[PDB]
Amino acid sequence: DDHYELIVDGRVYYICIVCKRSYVCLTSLRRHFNIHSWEKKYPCRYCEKVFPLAEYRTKHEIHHTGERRYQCLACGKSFINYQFMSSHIKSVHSQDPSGDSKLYRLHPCRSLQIRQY
DNA sequence: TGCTTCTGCCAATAACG
């Protein structure tokens, strides 16, 4: 009982018992619920900040290494995260990387070990 | 106002038996 279910128009939703946020996926509810329970801790390996989600920790750790995984394909400049990449492409090249063309490249993470695609 | 950090989807990984 970390949740209850709402069903509307046949659509099933999962509701956090603590903050009442709704989720389409039970996986999302559980991932989210750690924020309340802190059953799992995700400590930074370079400082000792601790995160409630594994992905928050990983994004943070990349800031420590300084790796620049995001590369603008228009001019070659590289950026540490999606937001800097996107902002660059929008302001400098007047294009939207969420459009129908691929304007950037996401290099593999090499400054540390995360699972790979 | 401009950085900065904060859930659906499903591939990669793990757990199971």
Add this chain to the structure above:
DNA sequence: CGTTATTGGCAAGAAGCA
């Protein structure tokens, strides 16, 4: 060891700062 369960990387918009 291969079948099922779980993890968490990713996008990109939202929210949270100051």
